[PDB]
Write a protein that binds this ligand. Structure first.
Ligand SMILES: [Zn+2]
Lengths: 329, 222, 240, 174
DNA sequence: ACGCACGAAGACCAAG
């Protein structure tokens, strides 16, 4: 059952790409060794082949949010908003194995490997939450197959398709944000500012003396000071994204849980940058097998009423024993 | 009963298989998906994944293999090392431990190992056109491949979406179905190229280590 | 040698431990090495503990471990087999680059297992499949199951040598990481991109991940000279 | 909780954008080499996607104030005007390391790399100040999601919404 | 009595 979620990011989305990358003050990525280099944390990019000026399609880096990140985002939304409160209402208590299986699919509850009977597989793969995300000691296959967050861009037309040509952006959708850290002791200006420090002026003097000695030693040639200047690449705000979620053979409860998470999804962030408020977005359209089920007040309407009732009934009858059995603890 | 060439086109990059990706394995997975759709999840997967429209090759010792070559990987771009992690948010875990939702007595998490272990793993992503050759029914193979949405591993995170597929009847001279894990005593004449003896399964599932056997695996395909 | 656990009684010659239960039911494979546990074979139920992070690599859900695996699962055995090459004759250490080059260019003929840990300590030996033919070498690096073909390694080394025979500043045709972790692992470098023919570029893009990992050790400005690794099974036995 | 604060700048706002720029006497940025060029420290701008009157969406630069700058402004206000007066009223002295951690998140450039105990995490994340910002040698997750300073402009309509359209300013604000 | 918890420990080559 296809779900098409159209997402517009209010704030820049920062999915840090692994690796050590460098940039200069002018913005040149990986500058030559002649000029000063500053560390850079680039956004995640997937190499895709795109028709750059027609001709022969060439590989271009497309900034995306990884599919695993959004799989975990959906899981966290479900747990934090519709599952964990439901279990608290029953005063349910989760063991370490059940908690690990629910929140990360970990198998530390019983890593020996547990045999699952066919009746048990039917019972547990139909669980409203644990059926969607498999794992645990059983390592059941989850019913959920989420995709990455591909922006509606000229280079993603071979992945997204031509259905959203009106919302496409032609230029590059990344930028470099420069970040600086200051030594607070270097910004004291009077004994009033140093009053709260136990050593008063002597502690600040010792700190500055040690900083000067370390800086001079490093210049001539351990420990690192607080002053730092670096950069990181983020995907600019306002770009539209298409998110695709699929399920193999869902029950009504699982689709209802998906729709509840979608209703509560905007309260969460995408990728990283929690300190800088990165990843904020608004859902613009949810499409359930070709029909639009998104209203201004969230996913509603008669076409999605059965799923909500089914998931409400499943939540009311939800017990921690199901989680314990799934975790095989 | 008919020589075919199965071609798969990708809409998203697939996970580059570490070992051979067999056409009969994918067909068996799709057939098991059909049986799950009709009956349910309580079926034994091993009772239905042999019901494929492919003829079998049987060697002298009775070892048999489906006539479906391992998929050929031709890369439209260089492979990309995709990084993924796994972690439990320690802030939420600590809050749940405080509020009694989680029953844990350990004072601190251990990111090196245990329930709260951070893990770093990588797998490669490739843009490829999957081509493989098989002996079987064109109509039924095309019908089975119609329901296939993704190719390769890591399907849960949306890797390897199928843009389209095609099944074509080709002359035998183009290529053979023997580019797969052959039985140990497979006849030399039917083998295409050099085959190195290795341990692999001859039937799906190929990941089952109890079913692994000394088999001839093509060196120009692994 | 057929199973990973076969290294115990064949190169370590360790008798089974005491207090082990005897299987008296229908045969079922070991949860670690997939070895059948028939009637009369000594086994032990699975007690891996909460720090076992290899549930995905378990061969079966029988929750039974043979005595050879129990010996393999000892801490002394795990540490000793972090960078170990176990052939029929004995256990060698491939930690050095020269040993890796020798193994991946001039492998031993007999069946052997190749291990390499990607961290401080990992469960490797019971996961590594046996290399039946030296032309198709199966290498277990941490959590990745690698297939290394020595002919491809030799061809890539020759490609690099032809590319950099004249220029004084040696440049790697393909970007490679020893940890197989960088996002540029296996991608063509610039110098290889505008200094290699179409056929050589196609060959470099069509190598297995294991071959990239091996070339990340063998391919440098000054290629290591292959050398035979030193036997280690005496050290492991002494520490056990 | 979502807090939206409306700000009007009495005096011009200057946030230096790193990097060398040049301007001519006329006022043309990065002039042709023929004319005389003078060093220019441009105001920081963030590229944003704006739906102009044409109906199409294009990436445009928007003069903003970084979210890190606003975060440090909030932290410095909190410390210098609320927390530190209380600490001095109760005669509480911070060490130099605690001072640097409160004012910059960490007392040095090397994180510990050792996990924190669960009770310590709960205690810090419930703290009025350390809970909001976090950090420390054991890099803790704070509660404060603080954003940049976006001018109410025609170019920031897709970001901040359309409930402040009456305060929007059309032309260049730089 | 039994399961959980906590620290010491041991493999270690090493580049562009
Ligand atoms: Zn075993």
């Amino acid at each position: 059952m296809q779900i098409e979620v159209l997402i517009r990011n209010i704030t820049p989305i920062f999915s840090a790409a692994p690796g050590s990358y460098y940039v200069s003050l002018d913005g040149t990525i990986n500058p030559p060794q002649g000029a000063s280099r500053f560390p850079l944390t680039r956004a995640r990019t997937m190499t895709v082949v795109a028709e750059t000026g027609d001709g022969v399609a060439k590989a271009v880096p497309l900034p995306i949010v990884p599919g695993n990140t959004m799989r975990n985002l959906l899981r966290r939304t479900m747990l934090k908003d519709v599952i964990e409160p439901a279990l608290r209402d029953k005063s349910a208590q989760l063991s370490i194995g059940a908690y690990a299986t629910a929140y990360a699919g970990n198998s530390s509850g019983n890593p020996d490997g547990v045999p699952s009977s066919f009746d048990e597989i039917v019972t547990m793969r139909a669980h409203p939450f644990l059926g969607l995300f498999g794992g645990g000691p059983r390592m059941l296959q989850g019913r959920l197959m989420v995709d990455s967050l591909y922006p509606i861009h000229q280079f993603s037309q071979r992945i997204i398709g031509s259905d959203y040509i009106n919302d496409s952006i032609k230029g590059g959708i990344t930028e470099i944000v420069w970040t600086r850290r200051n030594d607070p002791i270097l910004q004291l200006g009077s004994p009033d500012d140093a009053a709260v420090i136990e050593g008063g002026a002597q502690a600040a003097n010792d700190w500055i003396t040690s900083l000067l000695a370390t800086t001079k030693a490093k210049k001539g040639k351990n420990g690192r000071g607080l002053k730092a200047f670096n950069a990181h690449e983020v995907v600019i705000a306002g770009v539209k994204w298409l998110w695709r979620i699929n399920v193999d053979r869902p029950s009504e409860s699982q689709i209802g849980l998906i729709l509840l998470a979608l209703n509560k999804l905007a309260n969460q962030r995408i990728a990283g940058g929690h300190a800088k408020d990165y990843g904020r977005f608004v859902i613009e359209d949810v499409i359930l097998d070709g029909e639009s089920v998104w209203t201004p007040s969230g996913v509603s309407g008669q076409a999605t009423e059965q799923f909500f009732d089914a998931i409400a009934e499943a939540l009311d009858g939800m017990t921690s024993s199901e989680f314990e059995q799934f975790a095989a603890s | 009963m008919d020589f075919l060439k199965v071609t798969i086109n990708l809409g998203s990059p697939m996970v580059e298989p570490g070992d051979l990706f067999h056409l009969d394995a994918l067909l068996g997975a799709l057939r098991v998906s059909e049986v799950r759709a009709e009956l349910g999840d309580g079926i034994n997967p091993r009772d239905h994944h042999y019901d494929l429209p492919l003829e079998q090759y049987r060697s002298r010792s009775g070892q048999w293999v489906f006539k479906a070559s391992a998929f050929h990987i031709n890369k439209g771009a260089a492979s990309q090392n995709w990084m993924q992690t796994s972690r439990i948010n320690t802030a939420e875990a600590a809050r749940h431990r405080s509020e009694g939702f989680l029953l844990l007595r350990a004072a601190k998490p251990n990111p090196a190992g245990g329930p709260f272990k951070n893990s770093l793993y990588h797998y490669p992503l490739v843009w490829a056109t999957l081509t493989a050759y098989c002996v079987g029914d064109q109509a039924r193979i095309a019908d089975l491949l119609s329901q296939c949405r993704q190719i390769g591993g890591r399907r849960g995170v949306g890797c390897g979406r199928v843009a389209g597929f095609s099944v074509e009847v080709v002359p035998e001279v183009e290529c053979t179905w023997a580019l797969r894990a052959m039985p140990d005593d497979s006849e030399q004449s039917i083998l295409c190229g050099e085959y190195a003896l290795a341990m692999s399964a001859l039937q799906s599932p190929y990941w089952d280590r109890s079913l692994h056997k000394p088999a001839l695996v093509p060196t120009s395909l692994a | 040698m057929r199973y990973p656990s076969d290294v115990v009684d064949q190169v370590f010659k360790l008798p089974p431990d005491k207090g082990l239960l005897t299987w008296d039911n229908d045969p079922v494979a070991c949860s670690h090495c997939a070895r059948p546990i028939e009637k009369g074979d000594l086994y032990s139920p699975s007690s891996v503990g909460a720090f076992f992070s290899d549930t995905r690599n378990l061969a079966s859900t029988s929750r039974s471990i043979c005595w050879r695996c129990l010996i393999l699962r000892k801490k002394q055995m795990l540490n000793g087999l972090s960078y170990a090459l176990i052939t029929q004759d004995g256990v060698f250490q491939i930690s050095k680059d020269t040993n890796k080059a020798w193994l991946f260019t001039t492998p031993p003929p007999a069946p052997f297992f190749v291990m390499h840990s990607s961290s401080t300590m990992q469960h490797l030996c019971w996961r590594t499949p046996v290399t039946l033919d030296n032309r198709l070498i199966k290498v277990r690096y941490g959590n990745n199951l690698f297939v290394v073909r020595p002919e491809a390694i030799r061809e890539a080394l020759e490609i690099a040598d032809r590319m950099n025979e004249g220029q004084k500043k040696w440049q790697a045709p393909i970007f490679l990481d020893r940890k197989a972790a960088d996002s540029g692992h296996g991608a063509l470098t610039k110098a290889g991109r505008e200094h290699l023919s179409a056929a050589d570029q196609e060959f470099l893009l069509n190598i297995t991940p294991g071959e990239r990992w091996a070339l990340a050790y063998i391919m440098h400005s000054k290629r290591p000279q292959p050398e035979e690794p030193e036997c280690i099974t005496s050290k492991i036995l002494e520490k056990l």
